[PDB]
Write a protein that holds these residues in place. Structure first.
Motif, PDB file in Angstrom:
ATOM      1  N   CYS A   4     -11.016   8.383   6.320  1.00  0.00           N
ATOM      2  CA  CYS A   4      -9.740   8.334   5.575  1.00  0.00           C
ATOM      3  C   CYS A   4      -9.095   9.713   5.591  1.00  0.00           C
ATOM      4  O   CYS A   4      -7.907   9.846   5.858  1.00  0.00           O
ATOM      5  CB  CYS A   4      -9.943   7.850   4.103  1.00  0.00           C
ATOM      6  N   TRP A  58      -5.368  10.988   7.733  1.00  0.00           N
ATOM      7  CA  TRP A  58      -4.171  11.532   7.087  1.00  0.00           C
ATOM      8  C   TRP A  58      -3.955  13.006   7.426  1.00  0.00           C
ATOM      9  O   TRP A  58      -2.880  13.550   7.201  1.00  0.00           O
ATOM     10  CB  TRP A  58      -4.282  11.374   5.569  1.00  0.00           C
ATOM     11  N   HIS A  65     -17.845  -0.139  -2.641  1.00  0.00           N
ATOM     12  CA  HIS A  65     -18.240  -1.239  -3.516  1.00  0.00           C
ATOM     13  C   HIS A  65     -19.683  -1.671  -3.194  1.00  0.00           C
ATOM     14  O   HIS A  65     -20.521  -1.761  -4.099  1.00  0.00           O
ATOM     15  CB  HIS A  65     -17.290  -2.404  -3.327  1.00  0.00           C
ATOM     16  N   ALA A 121      -8.947   2.525   5.045  1.00  0.00           N
ATOM     17  CA  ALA A 121      -8.940   2.489   3.594  1.00  0.00           C
ATOM     18  C   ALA A 121      -9.623   1.206   3.135  1.00  0.00           C
ATOM     19  O   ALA A 121     -10.404   1.236   2.212  1.00  0.00           O
ATOM     20  CB  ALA A 121      -7.504   2.558   3.068  1.00  0.00           C
ATOM     21  N   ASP A 137      -4.629   6.618  -5.388  1.00  0.00           N
ATOM     22  CA  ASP A 137      -5.599   5.771  -4.696  1.00  0.00           C
ATOM     23  C   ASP A 137      -6.558   6.725  -3.976  1.00  0.00           C
ATOM     24  O   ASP A 137      -6.120   7.747  -3.405  1.00  0.00           O
ATOM     25  CB  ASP A 137      -4.879   4.897  -3.675  1.00  0.00           C
ATOM     26  N   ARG A 138      -7.859   6.487  -4.068  1.00  0.00           N
ATOM     27  CA  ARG A 138      -8.813   7.447  -3.451  1.00  0.00           C
ATOM     28  C   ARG A 138      -8.771   7.454  -1.912  1.00  0.00           C
ATOM     29  O   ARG A 138      -9.184   8.402  -1.275  1.00  0.00           O
ATOM     30  CB  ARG A 138     -10.269   7.108  -3.879  1.00  0.00           C
ATOM     31  N   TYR A 139      -8.393   6.353  -1.298  1.00  0.00           N
ATOM     32  CA  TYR A 139      -8.558   6.264   0.158  1.00  0.00           C
ATOM     33  C   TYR A 139      -7.298   6.229   0.976  1.00  0.00           C
ATOM     34  O   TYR A 139      -7.378   6.238   2.192  1.00  0.00           O
ATOM     35  CB  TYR A 139      -9.343   4.986   0.501  1.00  0.00           C
ATOM     36  N   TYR A 140      -6.167   6.013   0.317  1.00  0.00           N
ATOM     37  CA  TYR A 140      -4.892   5.896   1.039  1.00  0.00           C
ATOM     38  C   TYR A 140      -3.867   6.752   0.301  1.00  0.00           C
ATOM     39  O   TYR A 140      -3.733   6.663  -0.895  1.00  0.00           O
ATOM     40  CB  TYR A 140      -4.455   4.438   1.088  1.00  0.00           C
ATOM     41  N   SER A 141      -3.199   7.632   1.024  1.00  0.00           N
ATOM     42  CA  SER A 141      -2.302   8.594   0.419  1.00  0.00           C
ATOM     43  C   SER A 141      -0.957   8.070  -0.060  1.00  0.00           C
ATOM     44  O   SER A 141       0.071   8.477   0.460  1.00  0.00           O
ATOM     45  CB  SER A 141      -2.096   9.774   1.362  1.00  0.00           C
ATOM     46  N   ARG A 187       0.796  -1.248   0.000  1.00  0.00           N
ATOM     47  CA  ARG A 187       0.000   0.000   0.000  1.00  0.00           C
ATOM     48  C   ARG A 187       0.816   1.279   0.000  1.00  0.00           C
ATOM     49  O   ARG A 187       0.367   2.330  -0.516  1.00  0.00           O
ATOM     50  CB  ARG A 187      -0.986   0.033   1.171  1.00  0.00           C
ATOM     51  N   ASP A 188       2.004   1.218   0.610  1.00  0.00           N
ATOM     52  CA  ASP A 188       2.864   2.391   0.690  1.00  0.00           C
ATOM     53  C   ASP A 188       3.704   2.677  -0.573  1.00  0.00           C
ATOM     54  O   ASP A 188       4.144   3.808  -0.787  1.00  0.00           O
ATOM     55  CB  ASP A 188       3.781   2.268   1.927  1.00  0.00           C
ATOM     56  N   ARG A 223     -13.201   1.056   0.932  1.00  0.00           N
ATOM     57  CA  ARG A 223     -13.393   0.348  -0.352  1.00  0.00           C
ATOM     58  C   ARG A 223     -14.602  -0.591  -0.242  1.00  0.00           C
ATOM     59  O   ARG A 223     -15.349  -0.786  -1.202  1.00  0.00           O
ATOM     60  CB  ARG A 223     -12.142  -0.477  -0.670  1.00  0.00           C
ATOM     61  N   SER A 270     -10.995   2.209  -5.926  1.00  0.00           N
ATOM     62  CA  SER A 270     -11.262   3.521  -6.497  1.00  0.00           C
ATOM     63  C   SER A 270     -10.042   4.387  -6.602  1.00  0.00           C
ATOM     64  O   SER A 270      -9.149   4.303  -5.760  1.00  0.00           O
ATOM     65  CB  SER A 270     -12.280   4.272  -5.607  1.00  0.00           C
ATOM     66  N   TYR A 311     -14.403  -0.967  -6.232  1.00  0.00           N
ATOM     67  CA  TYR A 311     -13.757  -1.302  -4.954  1.00  0.00           C
ATOM     68  C   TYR A 311     -12.414  -0.528  -4.865  1.00  0.00           C
ATOM     69  O   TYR A 311     -12.239   0.337  -3.985  1.00  0.00           O
ATOM     70  CB  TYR A 311     -13.555  -2.812  -4.832  1.00  0.00           C
TER      71      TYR A 311
END
Lengths: 290, 213, 216, 133
Positions: free
Chosen positions: D14, D18, D128, D120, A275-279, A203-204, D124, A239, A237
């Motif tokens: 989310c 951050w 979904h 995160a 990625d929409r949810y994780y930076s 993910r990173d 998702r 996104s 899913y």
């Protein structure tokens, strides 16, 4: 001394003027005991005879490929490599440090378990690398890596870039990773051994490829694009989010795969993804002319 | 448990001077070390947190330094209002522990006491006891001698003294000396006097009264 | 504005228990832990333990486990400490404090563990003398024969503060405390301004307001 | 459940997670928990129960002395809002000893990094589900 691979040994030496070095006993691989001779590298000069050869390894001139012979024939080989420890620290002469001590750079285009790692060197000849990887150290789970290979060359002095591709054996793209991937690179320059490592969660290191099929539909245009083919699916899913930029305060952000902007003349519209949810990292820009 | 050791136990300083207070920990505590001052009758007041970090509202005169086991609180130019006990504290691991404190006393010029004497009240006398009070007000240094005389005879064993903590504004002390007698003894004598000697007085000062008059 | 208001002084019998409180205001109660600290008269500071109000989690100094029990009531933003099976060793001032680095402590609760009975003070005037400066007169009140500590003394209901000295109490051979409080005022003010010392001794619920005047 | 509201809340979580990111026993949603698309298809309650348990796990950590104790959080910390949001979400789904102070700054960083990954995954899942269920 420890075994890097079959018949290849690494001799760890505390490096400083006036040895002492390490005593290494090589044994010829043969049931035979008599008439054995030893040579080093490509030279026919006989260095010794007997089933064993004792070497006081202190310098690179002491390393290399030792071969034992009998009756004019080659019996077996042992290659010694040196791993220098200077002032208590293992050398890192081979690769250029990209950060503090960051030698390898890894990126993943999706959550599949597949990723690529790259490193840089000034060295042009006599270099080999071997890469291994696993998820976790305790009860390590298999990651398979391909051979490392030159991938690019550039000017500074020249610099060479190597890369390798790895794939987690049994990946679960949707899961929350709890143990990181570990990558270890064995570097060998001539007879000098060095070791490099990296550790990260997929993910990173995510960096999507750029958006695809970028298009303009003038009426102030309607900018459109698609998710890259390599990105994880289903997209509902995994996104993405996007940034659209016009150029010759001028950037728009959207989760949609379209945007309406004011296309000036001579300008270009660029779009990138994250990625929409994780930076994690933004993708490279995809551009189209206004 | 971590032991916090402070030195010196006492410091007497001239205002305007620079001051250094030490604190040592029995184990390394990185910079998880706080300093406080506790003035008479108050709760401790945080002055410096995490070894060197400033606290809103505290004078810039105060700074701290050190990391690991040895720490210092410095007072740039000491002021009268700085009088009090300074403590350091392990803010690092359980149990939290405090040092034994350094008491800061301020030096000032010599000031002789103003002396006042008070006869006992009629309401007290009714109860069988007479307290005669002698007040020495706003003097410096703390040392002072007070002797009582009844009908010109020196008394012994029937008096007690109490002294205030050093004043925050003027750096002086005040002291009360109380002579306790029975109503019967009080009633038998006429002249009650307290005689004061102090570094600031060139001759002893006597305050006195004659009973009922 | 932040306040940590602790409960009043307490005289406790040996073997008995006592529970004291620390009412918090001006900040989010559940956002900090609440520590308790013991300080014997004229001595150093010892940490007892803390409570974390959100989950009621506690952490004790091993030296106080089984002597102290910390609780909190989120509905009133009040932290409590109960001390059990008391002995003279437990006589001390106890403070509550928020997180060390935020600089707020309560004013302290003085607990006296003794088998001796409470006794309120007798209050006698120390009258300004008819015979005084230099224009400065001294007057006061003698607060005698009380038990236990503390007493509070104020002058003119708290309106007079300048020049006041309230001496530390001395424990007499009788087992009772006594102290004087004095103040210096303009001698010109004597026939005009009244001077009253307000003496409160919570353990005996005694309140005395004594007017001090020139004699005769 | 209420897919859309959960999707909107998880997205805000989310963002919060951050918002204070510096320059740099545990419930994890594992492969077996069925939070992947195929798994949500068959039966989604398993995933949602695992998400619920993760949320309660984090809210308890954020209300513990790791976060309420010294070194004190600054008044600009988003930990307050994160905590309320974790509770907010757990509610839509179904309506641990003392830490050493010198260790808390590192523990808080580790918990928050792990929380970023968890949220995160949850975001998702809810996106979904909202789009396909």
């Amino acid at each position: 001394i420890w075994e890097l691979k079959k018949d290849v040994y690494v001799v760890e030496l505390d490096w400083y003027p006036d040895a002492p070095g390490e005593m290494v006993v090589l044994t010829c691989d043969t049931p035979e005991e008599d008439g054995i001779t030893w040579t080093l590298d490509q030279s026919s000069e006989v260095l010794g005879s007997g089933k064993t050869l004792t070497i006081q390894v202190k310098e690179f001139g002491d390393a290399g490929q030792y071969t034992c012979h009998k009756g004019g024939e080659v019996l077996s080989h042992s290659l010694l490599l040196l791993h220098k420890k200077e002032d208590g620290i293992w050398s890192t002469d081979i690769l250029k440090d990209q950060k503090n001590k960051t030698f390898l750079r890894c990126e993943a285009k999706n959550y599949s378990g597949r990723f690529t790692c790259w490193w840089l060197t000034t060295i042009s000849t006599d270099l080999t690398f071997s890469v291994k990887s696993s998820r976790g150290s305790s009860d390590p789970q298999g990651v398979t890596c391909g051979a490392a290979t030159l991938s690019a060359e550039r000017v500074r002095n020249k610099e060479y870039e190597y890369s390798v591709e790895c794939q987690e054996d049994s990946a679960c793209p949707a899961a929350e990773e709890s143990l990181p991937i570990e990558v270890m690179v064995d570097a060998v320059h001539k007879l000098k051994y060095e070791q490099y490592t990296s550790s990260f969660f997929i993910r990173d290191i995510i960096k999507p490829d750029p958006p695809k099929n970028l298009q303009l539909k003038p009426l102030q245009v309607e900018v459109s694009w698609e998710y890259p083919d390599t990105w994880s699916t289903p997209h509902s899913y995994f996104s993405l989010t996007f940034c659209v930029q016009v150029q010759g305060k001028d950037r728009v952000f959207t989760d949609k795969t379209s945007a309406t902007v004011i296309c000036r003349k001579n300008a270009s519209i660029s779009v990138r993804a994250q990625d929409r949810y994780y930076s994690s990292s933004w993708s490279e820009w995809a551009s189209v002319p206004c | 448990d971590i032991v916090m050791t402070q030195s010196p136990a006492t410091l007497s300083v001239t205002p305007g001077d620079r001051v250094s207070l030490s604190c040592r920990a029995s184990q390394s505590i990185s910079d998880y070390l706080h300093w406080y001052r506790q003035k008479s009758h108050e709760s401790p007041r945080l002055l410096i947190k995490y070894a060197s970090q400033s606290i809103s509202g505290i004078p810039s005169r105060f700074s701290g330094s050190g990391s690991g086991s040895d720490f210092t609180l410095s007072i740039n130019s000491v002021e009268p209002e700085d009088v009090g006990v300074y403590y350091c504290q392990n803010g690092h691991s359980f149990p939290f522990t405090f040092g034994s404190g350094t008491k800061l006393e301020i030096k000032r010029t010599v000031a002789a006491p103003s002396v006042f004497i008070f006869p006992p009240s009629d309401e007290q006398l009714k109860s069988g006891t007479a307290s005669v009070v002698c007040l020495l007000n706003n003097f410096y240094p703390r040392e002072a001698k007070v002797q009582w005389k009844v009908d010109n005879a020196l008394q012994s064993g029937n008096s007690q003294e109490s002294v205030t903590e050093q004043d925050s504004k003027d750096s002086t002390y005040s002291l009360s000396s109380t002579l306790t007698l029975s109503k019967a003894d009080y009633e038998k004598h006429k002249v009650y006097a307290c005689e004061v000697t102090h570094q600031g007085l060139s001759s002893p000062v006597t305050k006195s009264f004659n009973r009922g008059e | 504005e932040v306040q940590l208001q602790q409960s009043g002084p307490e005289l406790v019998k040996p073997g008995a228990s006592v529970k004291m409180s620390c009412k918090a205001s001006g900040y989010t109660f559940t956002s900090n832990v609440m520590h308790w600290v013991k300080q014997k008269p004229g001595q150093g500071l010892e940490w007892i333990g803390y409570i974390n109000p959100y989950n009621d989690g506690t952490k004790y100094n091993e030296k106080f486990k089984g002597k102290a029990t910390l609780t909190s009531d989120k509905s009133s933003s009040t932290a409590y400490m109960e001390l059990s099976s008391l002995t003279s060793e437990d006589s001390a001032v106890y403070y509550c404090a928020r997180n060390w680095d935020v600089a707020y402590w309560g004013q302290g609760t003085l607990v006296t563990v003794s088998a001796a009975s409470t006794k309120g003070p007798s209050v006698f005037p120390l009258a300004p003398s008819s015979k005084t400066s230099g224009g400065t007169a001294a007057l006061g009140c003698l607060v005698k024969d009380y038990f236990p500590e503390p007493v509070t003394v104020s002058w003119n209901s708290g309106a007079l503060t300048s020049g006041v000295h309230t001496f530390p109490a001395v424990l007499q051979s009788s087992g009772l405390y006594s102290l004087s409080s004095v103040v210096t005022v303009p001698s010109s003010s004597l026939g005009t301004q009244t001077y009253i010392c307000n003496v409160n001794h919570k353990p005996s619920n005694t309140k005395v307001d004594k007017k001090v005047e020139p004699k005769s | 459940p209420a897919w859309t509201q959960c999707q909107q809340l998880s997205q805000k979580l989310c963002t919060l997670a951050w918002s204070a990111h510096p320059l740099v026993d545990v419930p994890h949603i594992q492969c077996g928990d069925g939070c992947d698309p195929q798994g949500l298809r068959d039966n989604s309650q398993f995933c949602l129960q695992r998400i619920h348990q993760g949320l309660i796990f984090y809210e308890k950590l954020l209300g513990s002395d790791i976060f309420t104790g010294e070194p004190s959080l600054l008044p600009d910390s988003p930990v307050g809002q994160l905590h309320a949001s974790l509770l907010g979400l757990s509610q839509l789904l179904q309506p641990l000893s003392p830490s050493q102070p010198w260790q808390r700054l590192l523990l808080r960083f580790k918990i928050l990094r792990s929380l970023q990954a968890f949220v995160a995954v949850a975001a998702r899942v809810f996106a979904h589900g909202a789009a396909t269920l």
